[PDB]
Design a protein around this ligand. Sequence first.
Ligand SMILES: C[C@]12CC[C@H](O)CC1=CC[C@@H]1[C@@H]2CC[C@]2(C)C(=O)CC[C@@H]12
Lengths: 55, 337, 237, 127, 253
Amino acid sequence: SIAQARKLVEQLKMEANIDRIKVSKAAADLMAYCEAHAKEDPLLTPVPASENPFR
Amino acid sequence: LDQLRQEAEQLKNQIRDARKACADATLSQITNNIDPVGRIQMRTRRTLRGHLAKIYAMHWGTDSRLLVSASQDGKLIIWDSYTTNKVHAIPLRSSWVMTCAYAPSGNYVACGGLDNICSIYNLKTREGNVRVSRELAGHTGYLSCCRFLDDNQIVTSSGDTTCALWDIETGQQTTTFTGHTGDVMSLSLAPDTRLFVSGACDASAKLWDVREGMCRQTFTGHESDINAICFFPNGNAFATGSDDATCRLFDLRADQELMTYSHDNIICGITSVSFSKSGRLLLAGYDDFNCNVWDALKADRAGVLAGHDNRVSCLGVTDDGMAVATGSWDSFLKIWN
Amino acid sequence: LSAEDKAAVERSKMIEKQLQKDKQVYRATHRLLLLGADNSGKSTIVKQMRIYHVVKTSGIFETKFQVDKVNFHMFDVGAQRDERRKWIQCFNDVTAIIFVVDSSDYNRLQEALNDFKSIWNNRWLRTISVILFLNKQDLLAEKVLAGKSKIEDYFPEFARYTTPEDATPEPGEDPRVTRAKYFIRDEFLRISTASGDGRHYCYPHFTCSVDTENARRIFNDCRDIIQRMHLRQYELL
Amino acid sequence: QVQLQESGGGLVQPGGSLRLSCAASGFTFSNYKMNWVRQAPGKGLEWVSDISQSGASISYTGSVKGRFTISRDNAKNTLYLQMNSLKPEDTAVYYCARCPAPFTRDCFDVTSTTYAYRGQGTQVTVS
Amino acid sequence: MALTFITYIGCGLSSIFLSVTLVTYIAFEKIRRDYPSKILIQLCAALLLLNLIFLLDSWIALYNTRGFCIAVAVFLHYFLLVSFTWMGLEAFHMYLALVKVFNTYIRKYILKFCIVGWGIPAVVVSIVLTISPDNYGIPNGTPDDFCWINSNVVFYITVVGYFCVIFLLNVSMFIVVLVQLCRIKKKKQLGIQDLRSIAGLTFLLGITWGFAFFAWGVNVTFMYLFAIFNTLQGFFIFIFYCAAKENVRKQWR
Ligand SMILES: C[C@]12CC[C@H](O)CC1=CC[C@@H]1[C@@H]2CC[C@]2(C)C(=O)CC[C@@H]12
């Protein structure tokens, strides 16, 4: 329909104006978050059963 | 329609060209010096039983202790994971529930299904018995997912290709998110509860805005239906599990493909996706009765969770990340640590 | 074991008891999924079984009918989109699928055949038997007796088809009516007996609108389905 | 993303032959069962033909058993439908649809309206 | 002296393969979800106990003490009755799965079956002991010095009559299953697994125990035939119900 096509083209026009960062910077941010929170990850590093509450 | 189709095609081409120009180096060579996760072994710490029919949805609590589970026998059971004690066996009017959510405050539990109705149950009530607090009936398609926003607003995606932010106090639908052509299969709220992504039956996921619903972004990298979706812990990325036996890691504000998690010996489609506390591990449940664990930064399998007879159909990770609880179609929940 | 923990366990066991009471009812009833397009007399069949034996945008309508003191719970979809790819997986644990087909009209007959083929060869819908109902046999009788619509126009193989020797004749039925009726039944059974391999089986019936034996037929087919399942547990089949 | 582009088809005499091509992009072509459906004016979507992965399971609807044939080239990522003898009755908009959930035997709701993995389609007029 | 050797080797093979069946079905809980497996494990355990105690009674020449001989005879009689009752219970189960198909759910199915399978033989043994404890002092036993019922008057009721009732029920259910199978196979829609599985049903139901009628008269070949199949009942049950199943073999690897 005409209305559906108009809505779709308007949506694509809106989506074609946002600014996007380089993929390398996003990858670096992902690494930094996954490197600065590794000590707090129970599944990444298995904790001893003393403080493990699921026996 | 004479030229609208051509304009849309050329605009999509321009967006694709912009995305290609915005990609310097993929995540493969960026995380090339990172040591591997190192062959994670995880065992079934708890086995929760008591459901008759297949367990089709589950949701961890914010205290990381109580978890709600919805099973197709019309049953809603809240388990104390530590002691394997079940609390508040809630019977449903419609025995076709396909989703369940647990409020961040822990005071309400949402469940919806083929009845096109999202029922909000008040757990803490004066009379002492859990009862339906509010029935929300505005959707014309089956509810595939629902998530509590602020204990009074709830975002439910239905089978009529629409998401809806509701107002439980008044019972009316506040905002409607439209734009999906296929029925929306799952949704995930951002950590700040200002964004949320929805994965539908098309090859695309959409990042919306809860404030006004103007649908900021669309990511198109899959090949079949998207059954599960979940943000990264930092809220700047999200992973989608699709029906083409692949998982994909998209990143906000970059509109790119970061990683594809798939193997040649995997043909069954993904069903549930979740992240670890630090986001290093991606736990994906499959239709081959497994819950393959992937290293998010290196895209290699790190561990397999066996012990399920039928498909998993649901899995979640605690807020503190101590354990992961996976449901299944054999009516058994398994909690791993 | 603290005193609070003792109450928590005791409450759970008083929960367990309720779940055990619910399991007695869940296993007693047999859930049936009722498919069928708009042309089929699905609503008429529902009304007939509901009257015979015992909400604006509802997605599922449920009717429970008891025959021979056993309860069947039959669900038909209501306000749902035409795409059944996702919500059909919720019915993997139903006793049977009642697939009603309008055998009179042929403009959508092949559509019913494709729907049956898709239902049959589904990974999550396998090991589920279908009670195929070929509704409105009377209308087919007048349509084929008047000789205005030729079956070979839609299905060219009807020309090279003869009624099977095993076909039971209906008294007072012209041979052309029987030939067309059994051609439709065999056209469905050709898809049925191609990939089941004993996992699931089809139960064709020549139902009508006037007849009241639909409940009895469903009862008998469900009995056979459960018998076959139990025999398959012993690997006898 | 998944995109299906249909080419060929148009005005043809009642008895000519038309070749309908369908170019697929955004997915592994060899892993899906490709289809072919039609919609006549005022008649709705109607299934016409389908072909499994690498052929070997070609099927048609009753009305076009002896006239239409369907083939696919996984290397060229293309699906072809040859129509040797056309009739005035089968004038319609033809859609190159793709089954979802690769490595499957069933093919659900392809003829359903607003199907995601369906092409724009091409008009075929016979007169 | 060929009966002793064949009986010994059959009982030993049955014992070892029944132990294999129990460990396979207990260690792996993925293949024991259904009622037939939960009854098969009980029957296999009963048959393993029967074979082990029969081997012990035959091998040990305890023809001097009055206590141990009586105790072993009592336990052997109880295990025989338990095995017969478990085969009868399997037949009754298949009655509740094929003849009466609807409204067959009852709470604690396996518990209520175990109450009867190990309870009624216990009651019979207790009664036969309390009427006379000497009934088990010193024919199913090979020599005259085999710990077994010496009354020959309670042996008919407690062993033969019990076995007659169990065999009647088992053969009736076997005939019913055959009738259903034949009806199903004669429903052509358009136009060795079956024989392998049905032999497993025959050995599971103890139909081969019916050769005892022909060995009573005499009929030395029938006596040998009775001695061979019945001792190898556990081995054949393992073959047709543990190794035969494809899921068990897959889960072994
Ligand atoms: C076979 C059976 C009865 C069945 C047992 O499994 C093995 C047993 C050994 C001694 C046999 C007896 C049957 C009856 C016999 C054959 C006699 O009367 C002489 C020795 C007896």
